[PDB]
Symmetry: C3
C-alpha cells in the first residue's frame, strides 16, 4: 500500500493551487465578509463598493499581509501579484453582485460548502508549509521564528479580521465561524513545528511528500469533523 501513498504525496506536492483551490478560498472568505456585514450587506455593498472590495481583499490575502508584517517585508506586497488580485476580484464580484445572487446561493448548499471547506484545508496546509519554508530561508537556525510565521500563514486570518473591524469601528465576536476552527491554530502550530523540525533535518526521518500528506490529511480530517459534528446537533 505504501507505494500508492508515496505516489499520493509526490502528486500532492506537485498539486497547484491556482485557480481552483484559490477560488475555493477566495469564495469561502468573501462569502463570510458578506455574511458579517449583517443586514447592512445589501446596502453597503451597493453604495460603498471600493471599501467593500478592500475588505474582501484583506481577508483573501490576510495570511500574507500578516507574515509580511511579522517579517519586515512590505504589507502592500500582495498587490503585485495581478493574477491573484484579478481572480479574487472576480470571485468578489460574484459573491456580491452575481445575477440572481446565484454564486452566493450555490456555495451555501451543504454538499458544496463541504467540498470547499476541504479544498481550503489543503490550501492552508500549503500556506503553513510556505511560511515555515520562507521562514527557514531567511532564518534557517531560528526555529521558533519558522514555527510562528508558519502558524501565522496557517491561522492568522483572524487577526487581520479583528484589525479590519477595529478600523471600521465595529466589534463582532461572531468570530466563532464554527466554534471548532480553534483546532486550526493548534494544528498549524504542530504542523509547522514538524516542517520546521524536518527542514533543520537534525531530528526526523521520512519523506516530505509523505509527512506533508499526513498533515493535509489531518486538516481535512478535522475541518470535516467540524462540518459533521456540527450537523448532528
Amino acid at each position: 500500500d505504501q507505494e500508492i501513498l508515496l505516489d499520493a504525496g509526490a502528486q500532492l506536492h506537485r498539486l497547484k493551487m491556482y485557480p481552483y483551490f484559490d477560488v475555493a478560498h477566495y469564495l469561502l472568505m468573501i462569502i463570510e465578509v458578506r455574511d458579517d456585514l449583517g443586514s447592512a450587506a445589501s446596502i453597503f455593498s451597493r453604495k460603498h463598493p471600493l471599501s467593500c472590495w478592500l475588505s474582501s481583499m484583506l481577508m483573501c490575502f490576510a495570511d500574507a499581509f500578516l507574515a509580511n508584517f511579522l517579517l519586515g517585508e512590505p504589507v502592500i506586497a500582495p498587490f503585485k501579484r495581478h493574477d491573484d488580485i484579478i481572480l479574487a476580484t472576480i470571485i468578489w464580484y460574484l459573491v456580491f453582485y452575481a445575477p440572481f445572487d446565484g454564486i452566493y446561493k450555490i456555495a451555501k448548499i451543504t454538499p458544496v460548502k463541504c467540498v470547499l471547506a476541504v479544498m481550503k484545508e489543503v490550501k492552508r496546509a500549503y500556506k503553513v508549509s510556505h511560511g515555515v519554508s520562507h521562514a527557514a530561508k531567511l532564518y534557517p537556525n531560528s526555529y521558533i521564528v519558522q514555527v510562528l510565521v508558519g502558524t501565522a500563514k496557517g491561522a492568522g486570518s483572524g487577526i487581520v479580521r479583528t484589525l479590519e473591524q477595529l478600523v471600521r469601528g465595529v466589534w463582532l465576536p461572531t468570530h466563532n465561524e464554527l466554534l471548532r476552527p480553534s483546532f486550526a491554530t493548534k494544528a498549524c502550530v504542530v504542523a509547522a513545528s514538524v516542517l520546521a523540525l524536518e527542514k533543520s533535518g537534525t531530528y526526523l526521518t521520512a519523506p516530505h511528500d509523505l509527512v506533508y500528506l499526513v498533515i493535509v490529511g489531518f486538516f481535512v480530517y478535522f475541518k470535516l469533523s467540524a462540518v459533521i459534528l456540527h450537523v448532528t446537533d
Copy 2:
C-alpha cells in the same frame, strides 16, 4: 478656441510651485486644529498638562499620510521624524494653535473666509501628495499599477486610518470622523486621480503635458472641496 490656450500656463507655475512653506503651514494648521477640536472640552487642560503627548498626536496627524505610506511600503514609519525642517515648522504651528497669545492664531483661522483659504490650499497639497505617492510607488514597482494606485490614494486619503489607530491606542472612540461626508468621496477622488497618474507613468495612451494634468485634477479636488464649502 480660446479655452485650449490658457491650459499650459498654470501648470508650469503650478508644477514650479513649492508646497513648502505656506501649504505646509496651511495643512499643519488645519490638522493640528482638528487635533485640538477632537480633544473636546478637555483640550484646554490636556495641552497644558501633557504638552508632549499633545505634540506627538499633532505630529502624527500632520504627517499621517507619510507614516502610512511607509508602513505599506515596508519603509521605516519613523522616517518622517527625520526631515528636521518639516518637524520644526509643524511644531511651531503646533505651539501656536495650542498656545498662541490670546489664542489668536487659532481664531483667525476660524473665520469663514480664512478657514476657507487654508482649506483650498490644503487641496492642492493633497494632490501634491497623491502625485508623490504614485511616483515613489511606481519607482519601486514600475509595473504593479494597483500598488501605485493604493499608495497614492493612501497618500491622499490615509489620514483617517492613522487618526483611528491613535484614538484606539488612547482608548477613545469618535466615529464622527467625516467632518464632511465628501471625505468618503475624497478618497474616491484620490483613487481616481491616483490611478490616473499611475496610467500616465505607465506611458500608455495619454496626450497632455504633466503641467496640464496636475492642474486638471486640482480643479476637481478643489471642485469637490468647494462643493463642500459652499453648501455648508
Copy 3:
C-alpha cells in the same frame, strides 16, 4: 581627592555589568506577573486551558520594547524571537509564574521586599533599553536626533502600546493600564535620558564621561522608582 575616586569607579563596573540573566529574570518576572493578574479571576482557568495563547501574550510583554522598536525602525518585528536564550529564559519565568508548584515563584514576588528588589533592577534594565534605543537609532541615522529619542523612549517606556494592541486583538479593554503613577514619570524620564544620550553621541555641544552620565540616569530611573515605594 579622597572620594572623587569612589564614584568614578562605579561607572566602570556598571559598564561591566551584564543584563543576563539576573536582571532579565527580574523584568521578565515582573512583566509576566502583570500578564497573569490582568487575566483577572479567569487567569487561572485560561492559563491551564490555553497555555499557548497565554505564553505568546507573555513573550509579547517581555520583549515589547524590541517589537515596538523594530516596528518603528522598519525592521522585522518577529526578530526578537531569534534570540533563543532569551525566549528560553523568558519562557521559564513564564512557566514558573503560571504553573509553579504551590505557586511559589509568584508568591515570593508578592512580598513588599522582593517586589521592591525586582522593581529596582527592572529600572536599571530600562536605563539599558533607553540607551540602546538611542544608540541603534544613531547607528543608522546619527544626525536625525529626534528619531534617536523617540526610539529611545519607545524602547524605554513603550510596552504600554504593545499591551494596548494586545488587548484590542484579544477583545478586552482593561484601560486601567495604571498600576503605579510612576509609569507616567517613566515615559518622561525615558524621554530625557534619551535626549541626554542623543546629545552625548552628537558631542557637538558638550563633553562628559560616558560612564558618569549613564550612571546618573540609571540612578535617576531608580530614584523615581524608589520614590514610588518610599513615598507611597
